[PDB]
Amino acid sequence: SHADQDAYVADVDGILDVLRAQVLERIFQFISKSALSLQKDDRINCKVKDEQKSRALTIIVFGASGDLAKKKTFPALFDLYCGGLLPPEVNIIGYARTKVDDVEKWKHETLMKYFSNLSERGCHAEDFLKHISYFCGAYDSVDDFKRLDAVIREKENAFKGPEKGGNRLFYLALPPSVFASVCESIHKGAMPQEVGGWVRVIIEKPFGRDTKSSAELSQALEPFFDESQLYRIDHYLGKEMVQNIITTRFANRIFSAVWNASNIACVQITFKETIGTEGRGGYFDSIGIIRDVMQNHLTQILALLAMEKPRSLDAECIRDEKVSVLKCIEPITKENCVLGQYTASADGSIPGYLEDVTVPEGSTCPTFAVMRLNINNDRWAGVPFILKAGKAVEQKYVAIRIQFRDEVHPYGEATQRNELVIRAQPSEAMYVKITTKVPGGDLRQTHQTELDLTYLPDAYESLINDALLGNSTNFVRKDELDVAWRIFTPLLHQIDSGEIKPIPYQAGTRGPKEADEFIANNGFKHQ
Amino acid sequence: QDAYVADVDGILDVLRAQVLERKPDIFQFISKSALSLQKCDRINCKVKDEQKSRALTIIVFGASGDLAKKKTFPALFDLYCGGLLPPEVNIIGYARTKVDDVEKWKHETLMKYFSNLSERGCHAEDFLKHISYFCGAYDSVDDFKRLDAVIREKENAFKGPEKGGNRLFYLALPPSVFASVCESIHKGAMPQEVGGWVRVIIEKPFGRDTKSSAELSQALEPFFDESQLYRIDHYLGKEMVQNIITTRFANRIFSAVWNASNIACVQITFKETIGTEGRGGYFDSIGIIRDVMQNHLTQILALLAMEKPRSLDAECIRDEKVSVLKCIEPITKENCVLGQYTASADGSIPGYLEDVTVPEGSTCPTFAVMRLNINNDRWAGVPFILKAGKAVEQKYVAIRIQFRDEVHPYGEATQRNELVIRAQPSEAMYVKITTKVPGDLRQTHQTELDLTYRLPDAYESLINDALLGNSTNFVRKDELDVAWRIFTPLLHQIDSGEIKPIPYQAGTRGPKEADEFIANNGFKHQ
Amino acid sequence: PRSLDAECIRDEKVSVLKCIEPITKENCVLGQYTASADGSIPGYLEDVTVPEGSTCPTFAVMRLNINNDRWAGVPFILKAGKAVEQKYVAIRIQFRDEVHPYGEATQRNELVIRAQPSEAMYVKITTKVPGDLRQTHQTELDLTYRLPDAYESLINDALLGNSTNFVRKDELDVAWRIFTPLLHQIDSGEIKPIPYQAGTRGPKEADEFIANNGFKHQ
Amino acid sequence: SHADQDAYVADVDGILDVLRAQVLERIFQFISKSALSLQKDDRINCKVKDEQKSRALTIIVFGASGDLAKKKTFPALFDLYCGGLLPPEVNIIGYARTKVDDVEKWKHETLMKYFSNLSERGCHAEDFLKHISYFCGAYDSVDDFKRLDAVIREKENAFKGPEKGGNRLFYLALPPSVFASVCESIHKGAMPQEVGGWVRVIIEKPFGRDTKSSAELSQALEPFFDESQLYRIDHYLGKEMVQNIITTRFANRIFSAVWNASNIACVQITFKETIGTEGRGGYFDSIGIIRDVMQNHLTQILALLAMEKPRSLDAECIRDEKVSVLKCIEPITKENCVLGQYTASADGSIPGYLEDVTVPEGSTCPTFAVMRLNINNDRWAGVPFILKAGKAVEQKYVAIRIQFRDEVHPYGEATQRNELVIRAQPSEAMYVKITTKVPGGDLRQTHQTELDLTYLPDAYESLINDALLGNSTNFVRKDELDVAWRIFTPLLHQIDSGEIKPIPYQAGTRGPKEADEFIANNGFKHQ
């Protein structure tokens, strides 16, 4: 029955392929006619693409003096440069409100301080600054963007290459409250030239804090930029993990056939940090652990892991699949959620969550959450999916763990549950645990063995790269974002209404003992 | 063309997604989705010889109003493109505001709202040539005499055999000015004695209770009679009414089951996803019952429940509409559940009370389920349920007739048959029955039999009907009176606060209590 | 098996063999070796103790059909050859391809259990290469963690009284019923061995037979 | 990519060198430990060698009365003597079946007639004969070899030098049919004394006539003598050409870096003689031009020229390389071979091949062959290699010609293909053709110039010398010989089966016009 669902998809896809094979030799009405008839039977080595070095490119980092841009975005562009993935004629413009006199001292004192000191990159720092300009403006004056437009065209017409016009990535390293005006501004007069050039806009979290707030922003931006252009970025989702999820499964019959209710006992996605929040109640307390990394980061990982088979690796096909599976998820219930808030470490080195000037005294805000999701579809019905996130815990870990059902017969206690782990932190690792024979001679003399399925810019860097390459896969689409918010918002309301409460846990522990009881009571068996 | 490799792949991508959602048993589904994925011409004149034999003038009062410019004029345009207006048709937009440039007015106020369809848009300029603007009062006899002269002008120039002219007056106005417009027409701009009829379309609301409605009917009747008067309900399509009347009355099978001994319940449902959209203030005076239930749903009920007409002539159908309505008991508060929408989850629809033009403490229902009792031989003890809702989970209008179950012998291997007539979001009509599956008789399948074989839309259908003089789908004076007597006690109870609307979230089905009410009044889910 | 006891394993050996249809001549390609290029292996017919006109096969590929729920329509191919290109004994399970979505960026997974010329057991899968998902690599996962050799293992087994790897009487009977019609057809001359040169893989027709019965090379 | 292959070899060799540098200061397990840790980061002037004049040496020329021995081997030993490369105590024994009475008249009438008359050597003839003995025996009687053994020990114990025992070179100037018995005979009782002495055995062509025949001989000899002892000799491969091939390339970055597919357009190895076969159909007709010089002589030249880089100049390292590259050669096809047979010269002075009593009338035997080999490896894939051999042609020539790809841009017709020529006959010559500027002044005014890369016993003599010195480089090893035969045998079969036929050509012409068309159609452009 599980085999027939997959077979039905594979049949449909096979029928579409033979239509495709025909309708690529000389119209909708040829589909219907063929349907009836089928029935009857060191130096930066440039790695960039040709199209990439074929037209001009300007990256505009708006809010260029803000912490995010100088400490993260520009150092990330710097690494892409060093790794030979920026086009060689790349123009980069930091835009910001403060007027500046010595442009070169700004690049050095505001930007360079934060570049990578590593000796493999030290050499290139000054090289990369030749590509950077400064521009002083506001985020709402149509004037300033007409001025910017002229500056961009200056650099664009100066390009020494075949195609005219210029591609423009607008990076809004800004508070979301200004996204709408900046976007309207770019629409009114800083879009790429008519002759040629794509436009793309990277926007930064938070993408609202609930269904309502998030949809307001989407409605606000959608008059000016469509889903082929907008790129809602998640700093923590890396290429390497996404490929581990998609390829390992979908390229391989062995894994594909077991990726279902009939074979999987339980699935946990875990995001754990030893660091706390000290001195950042300024952002965190309003947000909480669920909105911070679970609604956005863990849920995209879930979507990629649980989705049905896309017909191809085209980005929007994958995104279609993320949306369909997210739509099968029941809104999380307060009955399926255990919350924590951290207090001071036993040793007394790390201070508790409430022990912070920037945190409302008596705050009830969760720094820890374990929850069970139910995915109601043919593939997943009944399978526990556990999401876990926690700050100030025992170790820094990010992994998927899939636990498969035991074969009780006939090995019994001489075997145990196979598992598959996809780890991204503290380092990349992907393995299956299986039971093998030992040499030298009874059949029940067995070992556990971990098979290593394993065969560079970091997560953030590779997202900027994908956006330059025009690949939307790992970016949350508008519809996708809405559904995710609908999965979490009702629980978030019950939390704000006090209906469930965080359990205290000392910084440096696993978290609340009740969380582990919860996990073990939701289908997981300790190895 | 590496963008031919692309677009067909997207086509396939859409087909794929269709089949994986619906999951057919696949070639034929792909076949019939390819054809649903497809689905400078001269206007061929489809008009009768009586219609081309005399001049026609259509006068839209309130022409610069939202109803007339967004709905009436685009409708007339569609009829023009469809060949359903005579070739020499004269249409006059009458309004109170002076206009420097009538040609600008035509482009900016009307053409803006014409269907931007390829096979329509290229007639727009030809259509505007049939349209004039006229500036006047709605109550001054001299203005209608000046209108009369503007019309006679066009009539007396008619390039055709009969003299005089037919005049359709469309009153796209508040009901408060109808009496004065009608009187003004009576005294000032009736058709020429030499020849032509006068017809007058008037828009809802037709009062807000028995008394006010009767007052309004008495205020109009000295000027126009029920052969002239056309109380339009925009939603009642020709296609759904043929479904209701022919399927039943032409067939022994459906005639024979259309009664108390075979029908468990009947539900007439009107659902929209839109809210009041800023215009809460206006709606707050009316409420959902007066808005669509006392008028639209009740006409549907009438047609569904009537005895057999002495003929298929319009007034015979109307007589039967009247007779069955006369058998309906006034709705009680106990047989009524009210709702009032709150904000949608994504906030695209603000709550009904969030609208600043809605007064604090409003108790106005945006949703209503109720039960009517038709006390006659055909219907005694059969629950008729009317349901109407704004800001619910989908856009949908349908009749669902559920027949009594056959307990023996199939037991749980069968369930209640249904006949469904849907008008929105598309036309369908079908029966759910149980059939065998291709050893045991107990192995059965619920199956749907499609009974249903650019036509004009429901509103356009009614305007065409009024041009041809077919009264069928218009509420007659006596019919209207009786309809108000069904609902007015309930409305009084509601206005005295005896029933309170239950809050529901916009985008949901409505209050859980409304579904329980349906399930408690003869409906089974299965 | 109902358990890992020897006779339970043997019961199951018997049951599955009982589901196999007798091999037909049409599902059999025969070979007979000729002299190696360097003459180190004289041709089969050059041996004086071989009678003139011998039609005896030194090589055989054939297909068996296991008619049960688990195996219906799965080709099982047995191949045995003398004087071919290498010394080798292995099981190769090839899994069905995932056409969508990787297309030509993937290929059929395999599980291989080799005993000769050394023990190996491994799965071929496709994995990602460390931007595009379409960039993939075929990789081999070793599943295998002076022990006695195969023959010594069996004698030890007989000393300990473990029957597992020995053909039981009923099992044997059933095995003969799989092959005997084919052997009769072969002894009546209805199939003729194709000459192949010693040191080569065997007749080209044997490889084509494999490729025509569900195996893809890639 | 071509640069990365060479770089990979040079890296590996560099890693092995640092292992070598460590593991020469105090075991396999030290390789693995150092591997992980490297990751984390007139009168004869005697020219002979000391070892040579340090132990006794007996050269036994078996079949000493045969034509080969008296006309070639003994005169060749005579020249080595004159050139001061035989040890001064050298014993030389001619062995043969005829019983002889006056040993001194045999040396004079059978041997001396054929020594070099040249006045620089005339003087030494009688000197060299003092070193020669005669021995009468058969090639299968264990008795005779025990008798020989005693005679050798006689001469060996009489040696007036430090080390005891005696080194023995057995030279089988014999028909190959007797190699096996003579070798068994020497094994049974004429090997060097236990105390000391190497044994070496020179055997003479033909080494079979195909894969099967050649491997029989190898199996026959290998019970008695291994590959450090057996010396399959090719009279025509000279030291001077071998060094030109190996040194010029492998000692020099300039040549090494261009010795590949990416730079070379085509390569021809040519062996041409004006002489015919008259009165030697007795050997030739059974053999043909392909087996005579192409399978054996041209192919060793090819191997040396095409081989990958050996880690050192140790002989067996070079031979390993000859084998690996030979293994990359596709068996020659009849589609890639043009054959000729010569008829009488136009002038009518040289008689045709069939015009000979010792030649089967109607013989189809090729006196001429041009063929294309494909070497399927990273270095050579797609590069035409043309072998050409012909008897009774226009000139006596033996040369390698390497034709490099044109640099079309930017000199155009003011430049042409560089070439490298290594000639051995009619005289030694090695040059590159390149394009230079002329003085007195446009950049496109250019000349062709041949650079001379040039800075003594003959070919045969220097092979006997290498064998005395124990150097196997220019001798075909057992595995090497097998692979070469596998490259040629299938074509030789198609030839014997008549599937391609020789074209007639008049003695004294280039050969068949079709051969030159063939060459020009296989990548070569005339200068």
Bridge partners for C64 per DSSP = C76
Asked if C167 and A493 count as a contact pair (C-beta separation under 8 A), the reply is no
Which one is catalytic: B186, B296, B445, B525? B296
| β-sheet with D199-203: strand ranges across | D132-136, D91-96, D56-62, D166-172, D199-203, D230-232
Q: CA D472, CA D480: separation in Å to the nearest integer?
A: 12
The tally of CA atoms less than 13 A away on the side-chain side of residue A335 is 3
Q: CA A230, CA A480: separation in Å to the nearest integer?
A: 13
Asked if B386 and B266 count as a contact pair (C-beta separation under 8 A), the reply is no
| Residue of A13, A15, A29 to mutate for B, most B C-beta atoms under 10 A | A15
Q: CA A16, CA C101: separation in Å to the nearest integer?
A: 13
* Technique used: X-ray
Name the D residues in 204-233 with CB < 8 Å from any C CB.
211-216, 219
Q: CA D461, CA A363: separation in Å to the nearest integer?
A: 101
Looking only at Cα atoms, what is the longest distance across chain D? 84
Strands B198-202 and B166-171: parallel
Q: Is A429 helix (H, G, I), strand (E, B) or coil?
A: strand
Question: What resolution in Å is listed for this PDB structure?
Answer: 2.4
Q: CA A301, CA A386: separation in Å to the nearest integer?
A: 12
Nearest-Å Rg of the Cα atoms of chain A is: 26
Strands D230-232 and D264-272: unpaired
Please list, in sequence order, all residues whose beta carbon lies within 8 angstroms of the beta carbon of residue A276, skipping any fewer than 6 positions away. Answer: A342, A350, A351, A353, A367, A391, A392, A507
Q: CA D99, CA D65: separation in Å to the nearest integer?
A: 11
Asked if D96 and D207 count as a contact pair (C-beta separation under 8 A), the reply is no
Which one is catalytic: A2, A108, A131, A297? A297
Q: Is B236 helix (H, G, I), strand (E, B) or coil?
A: coil
Q: Do D489 and C37 touch (CB under 8 A)?
A: yes
The tally of CA atoms less than 13 A away on the side-chain side of residue A302 is 34
Helix locations, D290-412, DSSP H: 299-306, 315-326
Determine how many CB atoms are found less than 10 A away from the CB of residue D393. Answer: 26
Q: CA A483, CA A478: separation in Å to the nearest integer?
A: 9
Q: CA D518, CA D369: separation in Å to the nearest integer?
A: 11
Bridge partners for A419 per DSSP = A403, A433
* Angle, CA D186 vertex, CA D180 and CA D189 arms, to 5°: 140
Asked if D482 and D214 count as a contact pair (C-beta separation under 8 A), the reply is yes
* Structure-derived torsion over alpha carbons of residues D68, D69, D74, D75, reported in degrees to the nearest 10: -20
Q: CA A304, CA C44: separation in Å to the nearest integer?
A: 60
What letter represents residue D389's amino acid? A
**CA distance readout (Å), A131 to A43, A45, A46, A79, D305:** 17, 17, 15, 14, 51
Q: CA D27, CA D43: separation in Å to the nearest integer?
A: 52
Q: What b/e readout covers C49-83, taking b as 16+ CB neighbours within 10 angstroms? A: eeeeeeeebbbbbbbbbbeeeeeeeebebebebeb
Asked if A314 and A504 count as a contact pair (C-beta separation under 8 A), the reply is no
Orientation angle between helical segments B210-220 and B477-495, nearest 10 degrees: 150
User: Residue D392: phi, psi to the nearest 5?
Assistant: 60, 50
Looking only at Cα atoms, what is the longest distance across chain B? 83
Q: Do A250 and C96 touch (CB under 8 A)?
A: no
Q: CA C106, CA A67: separation in Å to the nearest integer?
A: 43
Determine how many CB atoms are found less than 10 A away from the CB of residue D232. Answer: 23
Please list, in sequence order, all residues whose beta carbon lies within 8 angstroms of the beta carbon of residue B70, skipping any fewer than 6 positions away. Answer: B113
Q: First and final CA of chain A: distance in angstroms?
A: 30
Strands D429-437 and D397-404: unpaired
Asked if B391 and B341 count as a contact pair (C-beta separation under 8 A), the reply is yes
Sole residue written with tokens 């349908």? B398
- C-alpha closest to that of C170 among C52, C4, C2, C18: C18
Chain centroid, CA C125 distance in Å? 21
Sole residue written with tokens 């790129």? A231
The 3-class secondary structure across chain C, one letter per residue, is CCCCCHHHHHHHHHHHHCCECCCCHHHEEEEEEECCCCCCCCCHHHCCCCCCCCCCCCEEEEEEEECCCCCCCCEEEEEEECCCCCCCEEEEEECCCCCCCCHHHCCCCEEEEEEECCCEEEEEEEEECCCCCCCEEEEEEECCCCCCCHHHHHHHHHHHCCCCCCCCHHHHHHHHHHHHHHHHHHHCCCCCCEEEECCCCCCHHHHHHHHCCCCCCC
Asked if B187 and B139 count as a contact pair (C-beta separation under 8 A), the reply is no
- C-alpha closest to that of D364 among D504, D465, D220, D512: D504
User: Residue B269: phi, psi to the nearest 5?
Assistant: -120, 135
Strands A91-96 and A132-136: parallel
Our answer to whether residue B130 is catalytic in this structure is no
Please list, in sequence order, all residues whose beta carbon lies within 8 angstroms of the beta carbon of residue A222, skipping any fewer than 6 positions away. Answer: A478
Q: CA C181, CA D381: separation in Å to the nearest integer?
A: 51
Considering only the beta carbons, identify the residue of B16, B19, B34 that sits closest to A28.
B34
Sole residue written with tokens 């292992």? D19
Q: CA C174, CA A226: separation in Å to the nearest integer?
A: 69
Supply D388's token pair. Answer: 């050409």
Determine how many CB atoms are found less than 10 A away from the CB of residue B142. Answer: 12
Count of H-run helices and E-run strands, chain D: 18, 15
Burial class (CB in 10 A: 0-12, 13-18, 19+), D472: buried
What length does chain C have? 218
- C-alpha closest to that of D468 among D145, D236, D180, D233: D233
Q: CA B364, CA B288: separation in Å to the nearest integer?
A: 8
Query: How far apart are the CA of A23 and the nearest CA of chain B, in angstroms?
Result: 8
| β-sheet with D446-452: strand ranges across | D446-452, D429-437, D419-425, D397-404, D264-272, D385-390, D368-373, D337-343, D503-506
Chain centroid, CA A439 distance in Å? 44
Asked if A112 and A153 count as a contact pair (C-beta separation under 8 A), the reply is no
* Angle, CA A247 vertex, CA A246 and CA A251 arms, to 5°: 120
Supply C130's token pair. Answer: 């460390």
- C-alpha closest to that of D371 among D359, D356, D354, D389: D389
Sign of CA dihedral C61, C65, C70, C72: positive
Supply D285's token pair. Answer: 């007709």
Supply B405's token pair. Answer: 């179950």
Supply D226's token pair. Answer: 């291994």
DSSP C200: S
Count of H-run helices and E-run strands, chain C: 4, 8
The tally of CA atoms less than 13 A away on the side-chain side of residue B15 is 31
The tally of CA atoms less than 13 A away on the side-chain side of residue D235 is 11
Q: First and final CA of chain D: distance in angstroms?
A: 30
Supply A404's token pair. Answer: 């498969």
Q: What b/e readout covers D315-328, taking b as 16+ CB neighbours within 10 angstroms? A: beebbbbbbbbbeb
Identify the H or E element spanning D466.
helix D459-469
DSSP codes, A144-175:
HHHHHHHHHHHHHHT--SSS-SEEEEEEE-S-
Identify the H or E element spanning A495.
helix A478-496
Q: Is A189 helix (H, G, I), strand (E, B) or coil?
A: helix
Please list, in sequence order, all residues whose beta carbon lies within 8 angstroms of the beta carbon of residue B428, skipping any fewer than 6 positions away. Answer: B420, B421, B422, B450, B452
Sole residue written with tokens 């058709």? B191
User: Is some CB atom of chain C closer than 8 A to the CB atom of D516?
Assistant: no
Bridge partners for B95 per DSSP = B135
User: Residue B464: phi, psi to the nearest 5?
Assistant: -55, -45
DSSP D133: E
- C-alpha closest to that of B404 among B383, B429, B430, B422: B383
Q: CA B149, CA B135: separation in Å to the nearest integer?
A: 14
Supply B71's token pair. Answer: 């709905």
Bridge partners for A341 per DSSP = A504
Query: How far apart are the CA of C39 and the nearest CA of chain D, in angstroms?
Result: 5
Identify the H or E element spanning B241.
helix B238-249
3-state helix, strand, coil in chain A (%, to 5): 40, 20, 40
What letter represents residue D162's amino acid? P
Bridge partners for D385 per DSSP = D267, D373
Q: CA A57, CA A53: separation in Å to the nearest integer?
A: 9
Q: Do D215 and C35 touch (CB under 8 A)?
A: no
DSSP codes, D65-89:
TSHHIIIIIHHHHHHHHHTT-S-TT
Supply C42's token pair. Answer: 């004289």
| Residue of C38, C85, C197 to mutate for D, most D C-beta atoms under 10 A | C38
Orientation angle between helical segments D299-306 and D315-326, nearest 10 degrees: 100
Q: CA B320, CA A369: separation in Å to the nearest integer?
A: 66
List the single residue in D with minimal CA-CA distance to C38. D212
Q: CA A373, CA B342: separation in Å to the nearest integer?
A: 27
Please list, in sequence order, all residues whose beta carbon lies within 8 angstroms of the beta carbon of residue D89, skipping any fewer than 6 positions away. Answer: D53, D56, D57, D159, D160, D161
Chain centroid, CA B260 distance in Å? 28
**CA distance readout (Å), B63 to B95, B99, B108, B405, B491:** 6, 12, 13, 53, 33
Sole residue written with tokens 């990578």? A116
Asked if B422 and B447 count as a contact pair (C-beta separation under 8 A), the reply is no
- C-alpha closest to that of A313 among A229, A250, A398, A357: A250
Q: CA D324, CA D306: separation in Å to the nearest integer?
A: 10
Q: Among all residues of D, which ones are annotated catalytic?
A: 297
Asked if D132 and D110 count as a contact pair (C-beta separation under 8 A), the reply is no
Nearest-Å Rg of the Cα atoms of chain B is: 25
- C-alpha closest to that of D515 among D333, D363, D336: D336
Q: First and final CA of chain B: distance in angstroms?
A: 52
Determine how many CB atoms are found less than 10 A away from the CB of residue A371. Answer: 24
**CA distance readout (Å), A102 to A106, A109, A135, B339:** 7, 11, 12, 65
Q: Is B4 helix (H, G, I), strand (E, B) or coil?
A: helix
Please list, in sequence order, all residues whose beta carbon lies within 8 angstroms of the beta carbon of residue C159, skipping any fewer than 6 positions away. Answer: none
- Asked whether at least 3 C-beta pairs link A and B within 8 Å, the reply is yes
Q: What b/e readout covers A208-226, taking b as 16+ CB neighbours within 10 angstroms? A: bbbbbbbbebbeebeebbe
Identify the H or E element spanning B152.
helix B141-156
Q: Which residues of A touch B27 (CB under 8 A)?
A: 15, 35-36, 38-39
Asked if D378 and D5 count as a contact pair (C-beta separation under 8 A), the reply is yes
The tally of CA atoms less than 13 A away on the side-chain side of residue D326 is 28
Burial class (CB in 10 A: 0-12, 13-18, 19+), B252: exposed
Q: Is B520 helix (H, G, I), strand (E, B) or coil?
A: coil
- C-alpha closest to that of B421 among B253, B266, B233: B266
What letter represents residue A8's amino acid? Y
User: Is some CB atom of chain B closer than 8 A to the CB atom of A32?
Assistant: yes
DSSP D350: S
Strands B336-342 and B367-373: antiparallel
β strands within B136-262, DSSP E: 166-171, 198-202, 229-231
Supply C111's token pair. Answer: 């599980």
